[PDB]
Coordinates of C-alpha atoms and ligand atoms in Angstrom, one line a residue:
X1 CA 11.9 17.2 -4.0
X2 CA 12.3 17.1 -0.3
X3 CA 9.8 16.7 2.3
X4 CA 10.6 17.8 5.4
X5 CA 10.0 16.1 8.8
X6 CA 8.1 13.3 6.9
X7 CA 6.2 10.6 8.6
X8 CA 9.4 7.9 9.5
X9 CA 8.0 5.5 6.7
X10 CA 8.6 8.0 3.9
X11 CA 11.8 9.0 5.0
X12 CA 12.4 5.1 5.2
X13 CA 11.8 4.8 1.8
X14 CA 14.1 7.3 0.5
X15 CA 16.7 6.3 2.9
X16 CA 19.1 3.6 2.5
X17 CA 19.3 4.0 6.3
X18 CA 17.3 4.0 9.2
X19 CA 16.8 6.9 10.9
X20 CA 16.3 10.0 9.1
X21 CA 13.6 12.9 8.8
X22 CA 13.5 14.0 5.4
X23 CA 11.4 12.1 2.3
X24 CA 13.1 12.4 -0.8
X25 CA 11.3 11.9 -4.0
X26 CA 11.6 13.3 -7.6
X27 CA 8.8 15.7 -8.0
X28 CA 6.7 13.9 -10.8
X29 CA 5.5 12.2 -7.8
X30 CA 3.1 9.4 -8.9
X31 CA 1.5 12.1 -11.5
X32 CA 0.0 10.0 -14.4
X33 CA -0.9 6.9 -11.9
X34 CA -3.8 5.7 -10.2
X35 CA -4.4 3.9 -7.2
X36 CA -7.0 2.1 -5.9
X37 CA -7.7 1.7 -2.4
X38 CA -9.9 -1.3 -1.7
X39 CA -10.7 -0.8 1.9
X40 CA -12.9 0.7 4.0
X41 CA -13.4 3.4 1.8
X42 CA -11.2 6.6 1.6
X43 CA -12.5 10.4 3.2
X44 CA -12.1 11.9 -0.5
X45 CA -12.6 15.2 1.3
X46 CA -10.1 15.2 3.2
X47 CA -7.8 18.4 2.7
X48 CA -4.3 16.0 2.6
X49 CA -5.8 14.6 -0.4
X50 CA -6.1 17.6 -2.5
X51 CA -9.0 16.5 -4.8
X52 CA -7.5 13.6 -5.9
X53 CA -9.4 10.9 -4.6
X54 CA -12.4 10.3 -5.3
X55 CA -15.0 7.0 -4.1
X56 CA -15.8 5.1 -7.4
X57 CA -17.6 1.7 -5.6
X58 CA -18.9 0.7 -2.4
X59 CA -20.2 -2.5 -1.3
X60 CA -22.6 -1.3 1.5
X61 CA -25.2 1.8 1.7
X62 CA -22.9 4.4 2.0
X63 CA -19.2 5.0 -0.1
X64 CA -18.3 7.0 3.2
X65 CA -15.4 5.4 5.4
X66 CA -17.0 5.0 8.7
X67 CA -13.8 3.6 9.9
X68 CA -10.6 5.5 9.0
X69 CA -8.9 2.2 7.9
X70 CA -9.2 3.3 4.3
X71 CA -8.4 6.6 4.8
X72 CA -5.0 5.7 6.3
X73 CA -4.2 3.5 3.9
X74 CA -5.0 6.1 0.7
X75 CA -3.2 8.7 2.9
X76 CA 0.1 7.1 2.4
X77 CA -0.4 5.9 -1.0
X78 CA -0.8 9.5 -2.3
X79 CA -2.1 11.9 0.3
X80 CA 0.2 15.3 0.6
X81 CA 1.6 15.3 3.7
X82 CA 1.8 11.2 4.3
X83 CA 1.4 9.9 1.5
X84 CA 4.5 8.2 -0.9
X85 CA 2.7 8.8 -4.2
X86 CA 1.9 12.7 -3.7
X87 CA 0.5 13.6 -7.0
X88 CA -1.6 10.3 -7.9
X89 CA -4.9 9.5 -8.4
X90 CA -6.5 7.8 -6.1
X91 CA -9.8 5.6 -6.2
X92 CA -11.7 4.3 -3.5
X93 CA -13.2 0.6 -3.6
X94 CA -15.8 0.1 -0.4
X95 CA -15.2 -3.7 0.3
X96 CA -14.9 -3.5 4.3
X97 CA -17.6 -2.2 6.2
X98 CA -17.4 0.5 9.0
X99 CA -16.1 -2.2 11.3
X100 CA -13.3 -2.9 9.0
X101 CA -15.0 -6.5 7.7
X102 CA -15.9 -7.8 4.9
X103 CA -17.0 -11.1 3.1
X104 CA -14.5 -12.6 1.0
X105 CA -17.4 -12.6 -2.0
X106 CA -17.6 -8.6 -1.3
X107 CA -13.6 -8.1 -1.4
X108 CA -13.1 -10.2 -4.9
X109 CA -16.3 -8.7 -6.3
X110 CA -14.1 -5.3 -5.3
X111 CA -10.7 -6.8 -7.2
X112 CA -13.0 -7.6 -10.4
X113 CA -14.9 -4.1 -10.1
X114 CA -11.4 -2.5 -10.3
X115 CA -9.9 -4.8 -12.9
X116 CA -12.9 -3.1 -14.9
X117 CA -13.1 -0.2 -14.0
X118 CA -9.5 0.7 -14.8
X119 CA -10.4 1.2 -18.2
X120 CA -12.2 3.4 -18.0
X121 CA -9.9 5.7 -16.3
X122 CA -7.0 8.2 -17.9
X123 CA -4.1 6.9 -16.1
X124 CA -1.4 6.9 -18.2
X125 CA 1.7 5.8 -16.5
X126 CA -0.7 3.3 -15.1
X127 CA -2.5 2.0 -12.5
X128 CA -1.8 0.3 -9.1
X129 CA -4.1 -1.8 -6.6
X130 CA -3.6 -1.4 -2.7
X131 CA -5.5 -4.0 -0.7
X132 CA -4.8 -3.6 2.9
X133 CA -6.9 -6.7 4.1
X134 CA -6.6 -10.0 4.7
X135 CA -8.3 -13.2 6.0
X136 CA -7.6 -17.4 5.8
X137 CA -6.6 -19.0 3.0
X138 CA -8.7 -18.7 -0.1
X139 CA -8.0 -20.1 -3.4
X140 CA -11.1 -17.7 -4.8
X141 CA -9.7 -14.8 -3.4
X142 CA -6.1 -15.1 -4.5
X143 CA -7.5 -16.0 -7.5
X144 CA -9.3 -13.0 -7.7
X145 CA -5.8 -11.5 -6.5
X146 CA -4.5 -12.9 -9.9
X147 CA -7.0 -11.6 -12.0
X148 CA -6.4 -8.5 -11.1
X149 CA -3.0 -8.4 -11.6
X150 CA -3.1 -10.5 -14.6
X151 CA -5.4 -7.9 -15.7
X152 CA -2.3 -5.2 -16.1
X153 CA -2.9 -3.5 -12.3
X154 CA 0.2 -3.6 -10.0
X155 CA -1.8 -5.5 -6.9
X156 CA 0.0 -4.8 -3.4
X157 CA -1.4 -6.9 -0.5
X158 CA -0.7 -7.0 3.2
X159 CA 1.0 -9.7 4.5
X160 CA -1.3 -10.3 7.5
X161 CA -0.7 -9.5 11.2
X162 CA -0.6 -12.9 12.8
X163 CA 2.9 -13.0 13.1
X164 CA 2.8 -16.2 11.1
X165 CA 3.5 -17.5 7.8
X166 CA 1.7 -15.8 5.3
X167 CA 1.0 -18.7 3.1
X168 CA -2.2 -19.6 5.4
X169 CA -3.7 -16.2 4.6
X170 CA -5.6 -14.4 1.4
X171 CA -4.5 -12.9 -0.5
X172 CA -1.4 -12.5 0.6
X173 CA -0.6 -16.1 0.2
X174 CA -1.2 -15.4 -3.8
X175 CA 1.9 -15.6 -5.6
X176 CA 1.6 -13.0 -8.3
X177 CA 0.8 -10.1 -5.8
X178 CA 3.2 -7.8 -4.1
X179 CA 2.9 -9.6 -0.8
X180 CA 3.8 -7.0 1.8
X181 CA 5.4 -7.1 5.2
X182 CA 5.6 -4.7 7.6
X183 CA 8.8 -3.2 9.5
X184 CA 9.4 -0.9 12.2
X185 CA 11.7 2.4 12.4
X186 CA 14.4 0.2 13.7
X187 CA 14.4 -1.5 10.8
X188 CA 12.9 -4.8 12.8
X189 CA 10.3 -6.6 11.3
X190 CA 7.1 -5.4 12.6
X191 CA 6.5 -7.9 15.5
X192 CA 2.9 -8.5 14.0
X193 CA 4.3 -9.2 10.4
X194 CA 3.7 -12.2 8.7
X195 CA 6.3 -13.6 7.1
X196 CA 7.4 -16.5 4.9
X197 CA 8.4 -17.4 1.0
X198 CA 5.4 -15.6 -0.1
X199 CA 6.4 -12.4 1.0
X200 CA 8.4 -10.1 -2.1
X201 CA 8.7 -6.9 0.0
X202 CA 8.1 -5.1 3.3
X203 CA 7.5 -1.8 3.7
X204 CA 6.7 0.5 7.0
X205 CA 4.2 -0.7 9.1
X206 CA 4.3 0.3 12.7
X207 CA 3.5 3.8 13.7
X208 CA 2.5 4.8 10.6
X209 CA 0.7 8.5 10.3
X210 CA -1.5 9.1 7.7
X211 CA -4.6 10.8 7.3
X212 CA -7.8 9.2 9.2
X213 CA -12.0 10.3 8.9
X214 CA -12.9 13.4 10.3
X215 CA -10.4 15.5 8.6
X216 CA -7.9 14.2 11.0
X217 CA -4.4 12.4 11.0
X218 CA -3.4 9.5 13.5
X219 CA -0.9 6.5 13.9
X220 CA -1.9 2.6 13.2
X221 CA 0.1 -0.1 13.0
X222 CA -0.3 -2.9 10.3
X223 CA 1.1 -4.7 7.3
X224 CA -2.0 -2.5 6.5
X225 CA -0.1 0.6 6.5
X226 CA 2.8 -1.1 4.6
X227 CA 1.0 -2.4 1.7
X228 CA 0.2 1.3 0.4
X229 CA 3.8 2.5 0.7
X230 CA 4.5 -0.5 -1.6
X231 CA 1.9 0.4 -3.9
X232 CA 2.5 4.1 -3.8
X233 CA 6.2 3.4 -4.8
X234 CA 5.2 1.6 -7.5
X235 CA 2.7 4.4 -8.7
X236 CA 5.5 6.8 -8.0
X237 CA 8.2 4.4 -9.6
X238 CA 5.8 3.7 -13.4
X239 CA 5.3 7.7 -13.2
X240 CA 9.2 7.7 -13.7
X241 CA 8.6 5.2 -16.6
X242 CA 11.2 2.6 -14.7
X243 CA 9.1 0.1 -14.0
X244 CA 5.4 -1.3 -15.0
X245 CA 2.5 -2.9 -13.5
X246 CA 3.4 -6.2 -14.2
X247 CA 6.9 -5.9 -12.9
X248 CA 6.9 -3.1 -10.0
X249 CA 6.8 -5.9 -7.5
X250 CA 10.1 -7.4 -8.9
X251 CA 11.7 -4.1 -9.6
X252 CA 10.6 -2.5 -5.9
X253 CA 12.5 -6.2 -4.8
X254 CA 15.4 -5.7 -7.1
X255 CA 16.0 -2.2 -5.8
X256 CA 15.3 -2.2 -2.5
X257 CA 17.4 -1.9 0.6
X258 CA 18.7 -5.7 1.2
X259 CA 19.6 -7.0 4.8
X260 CA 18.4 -4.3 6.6
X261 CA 16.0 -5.6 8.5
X262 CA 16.5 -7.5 11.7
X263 CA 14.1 -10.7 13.1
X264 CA 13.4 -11.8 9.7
X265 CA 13.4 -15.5 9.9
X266 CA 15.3 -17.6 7.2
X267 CA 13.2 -17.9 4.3
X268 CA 11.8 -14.4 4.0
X269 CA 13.0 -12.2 1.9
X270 CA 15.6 -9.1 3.4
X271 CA 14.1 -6.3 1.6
X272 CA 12.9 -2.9 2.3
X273 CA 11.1 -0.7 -0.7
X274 CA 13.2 1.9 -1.5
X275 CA 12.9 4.3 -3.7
X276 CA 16.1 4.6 -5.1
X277 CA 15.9 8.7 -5.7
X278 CA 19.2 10.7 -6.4
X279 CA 18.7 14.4 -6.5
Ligands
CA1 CA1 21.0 0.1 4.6
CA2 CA1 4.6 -12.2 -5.1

């Protein structure tokens, strides 16, 4: 399949070069996979996402995103027109408030609620985790982090956006999480992207388009927007059987474009997801 005039990140990510228009991706398309969105909430009615999302917690009186934060994020794991994962399954988990905030008690109750609720889900080719947030250092929630990838869901994190080392942020910091930078169409790290050992990927960040609340679309910037191209490859990559939950992070790593990127300091991994798709 070929999607035409794609957002820059999903052409990015079909691309072993930067520059191009087009998003290439086998047509199976993340069908079989779920995602869950722990965020701000996602705008399940939102025409881009075709029925398949659906809120399944929230942490505050409403599911509804108030924001737009989680709506963007869900967009490009799986929406239509953004999103990397077109076919998947995606669940919303309410952890951030309308202003985007959220307690770090909230957040991991959100990674348990998910490590649960997965079971009770038909997703076959398996399920993925997309957690676009981020605060200090917390050895509860990377451990909650863990858990949740421990518990057989691929967990994709944003790095952070203090242009810093991720290891003094949660829960990127945790190692067994697909710690996520973010890049810019110039292939330059995103000059907001964390960076450091911890990092096992990056992924598009700046000027990223994706759906937003009101039945709209617009462009943020973020190791936000990153993380769910990460974690829709993955649901896209265990739809094609090549990879699983437990090893999309290393296999996204293994395959990805190397030394692409430019103002990566030493110590950080070179690598771009890619999705590795010959037609
Ligand atoms: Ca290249
Ligand atoms: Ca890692």
């Amino acid at each position: 399949a070929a999607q035409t005039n794609a957002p820059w990140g999903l052409a990015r990510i079909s691309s072993t070069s930067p520059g191009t228009s087009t998003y290439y991706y086998d047509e199976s398309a993340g069908q079989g996979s779920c995602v869950y969105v722990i965020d701000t909430g996602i705008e399940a009615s939102h025409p881009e996402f075709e029925g398949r999302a659906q809120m399944v917690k929230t942490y505050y009186y409403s599911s509804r995103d108030g924001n737009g934060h989680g709506t963007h994020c869900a967009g490009t794991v799986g929406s239509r027109t953004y999103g990397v994962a077109k076919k998947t399954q995606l669940f919303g988990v309410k952890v951030l408030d309308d202003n985007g905030s959220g307690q770090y008690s909230t957040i991991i109750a959100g990674m348990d609620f998910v490590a649960s609720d997965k079971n009770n889900r038909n997703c076959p080719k398996g399920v993925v985790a997309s957690l676009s947030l981020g605060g200090g250092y917390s050895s509860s929630v990377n451990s909650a982090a863990a858990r949740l990838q421990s518990s057989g869901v691929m967990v994709a994190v944003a790095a952070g956006n203090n242009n810093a080392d991720a290891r003094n942020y949660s829960p990127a910091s945790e190692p067994s999480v697909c710690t996520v930078g973010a890049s810019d169409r110039y292939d330059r790290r995103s000059s907001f992207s964390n960076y450091g050992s911890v990092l096992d990927i990056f992924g598009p960040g700046t000027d990223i388009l994706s759906t937003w609340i009101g039945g709209s679309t617009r462009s943020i910037s973020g190791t936000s927007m990153a993380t769910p191209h990460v974690a829709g490859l993955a649901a896209y990559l265990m739809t094609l059987g090549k990879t699983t939950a437990a090893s999309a992070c290393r296999y996204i790593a293994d395959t990805a474009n190397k030394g692409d990127l430019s103002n990566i300091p030493f110590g950080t991994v070179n690598l771009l997801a890619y999705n590795n798709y010959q037609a």
